[PDB]
From Swiss-Prot, chain B:
Changing residue 96 to I: Abolishes interaction with SBA1. Changing residue 169 to D: Induces a total loss of function at 34 degrees Celsius. Abolishes interaction with SBA1. Homodimer. Interacts with the co-chaperones AHA1, CDC37, CNS1, CPR6, CPR7, HCH1, SBA1, SSE1 and STI1. CNS1, CPR6, CPR7 and STI1. Interacts directly with the substrates GCN2, HAP1 and STE11. It is found in: Cytoplasm. The gene is HSP82. Changing residue 106 to N: Induces a 6-fold increase in ATPase activity. The lineage of its organism: Eukaryota, Fungi, Dikarya, Ascomycota, Saccharomycotina. This is ATP-dependent molecular chaperone HSP82.
Length: 215, 218
């Protein structure tokens, strides 16, 4: 089953600005998504203190970044609290309304795009380097769903019947723009992660496939 | 474990010998497994010469090594010809009989464990570093199956319904001994490959998961 909903106006407006902005420091997108992942892990960590059984679906708390060159895709995974179908819709398509409107207002007044996280809508910074995104989430309270959007004013939510089933958490599958493929490179990804992830209290794993070279 | 079979007696003898031996240069197990992977690839390649359709289930010919530290597992994958249920049974539990018997006689006469490949049974050297092995295979001619062994005299063959489906090929999922975990490390696997399998005619991909270290420890 697949359902389509429309973003609140202000969210669609910010996604348009961001997906076409010229900004010269797009690497900030990773810092924002790592921050959100850290937040999602904290939520499950907290909940598990009194409800340890909640971790059993996925015992390990981590953030995993997996570049997928063949598909020009970059996946940012966390074993956080995840999102139910209802949460994906609300959290990503509606509740950010006032944040994106305030941020849009700040940008017009001259603020730098890097301030996005300060307005709680850092999530949309992904469109700085991707023209499409699939958010695959598995919450202990629901089935695995796929939320998708190419910044067209609307988004769809589909019961996951194609992706690998995860124990618990969220995956942000970024379909990178053709001129932003540097973010598939281990070296570049590494440099960006180390630049702002000192605070992160969970392991940040990088999954890379490399053909054994030589001396 | 849909079906259970018995290895020819001699194969079981060799497996017990290998899983127990104190041989030091255990790293030779990888060269033998990569060599078997290469041979399997040479097989569909040759077959695809007149029947290119055979490659379509998996167009790329490669070897892939994936250490899974959490499971203390090391997987050796190839997109070779693969093995049907019947071939897994025969190839791994029966036809190695003569080879294992001659090798054991050779070891008694002073042969080195590293010469195992010369008797065509290098596959069993996996027991130098592993306690158990699961051979997950998919031939174009059969469904995906799992052959499992722990060096004991019996092995099982199970229709695969738990693992990820592969296009074509074989995965040697090795459950490493507690004292052989070094083979889960990228640096170590790379040096063993450069030392003994640096001229394999197929790309050897290493899938590694590395924790990004902190800018400044703590």
């Amino acid at each position: 089953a697949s359902e389509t909903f429309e973003f609140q106006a202000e969210i669609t407006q910010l996604m348009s600005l961001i997906i076409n902005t010229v900004y010269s420091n797009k690497e900030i997108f990773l810092r924002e998504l790592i921050s959100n992942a850290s937040d999602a892990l904290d939520k499950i960590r907290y909940k598990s203190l009194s409800d340890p059984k909640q971790l059993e679906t996925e015992p390990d708390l981590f953030i995993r970044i997996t570049p997928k060159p063949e598909q020009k895709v970059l996946e940012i995974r966390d074993s956080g609290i995840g999102m139910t179908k209802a949460e994906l819709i609300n959290n990503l398509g509606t509740i950010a309304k006032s944040g994106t409107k305030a941020f849009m207002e700040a940008l017009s007044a001259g603020a730098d795009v890097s301030m996005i996280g300060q307005f709680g809508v850092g999530f949309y910074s992904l469109f700085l380097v991707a023209d499409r995104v699939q958010v695959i989430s598995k919450s202990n309270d629901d089935e695995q769903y796929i939320w998708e959007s190419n910044a067209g004013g609307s988004f769809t939510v589909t019961l996951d019947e194609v992706n690998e089933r995860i124990g618990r958490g969220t995956i942000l599958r970024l379909f990178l723009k053709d001129d932003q493929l540097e973010y598939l490179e281990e070296k570049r990804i590494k440099e960006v992660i180390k630049r702002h992830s000192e605070f992160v209290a969970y392991p940040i794993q990088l999954v890379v496939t490399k053909e054994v070279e030589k001396e």
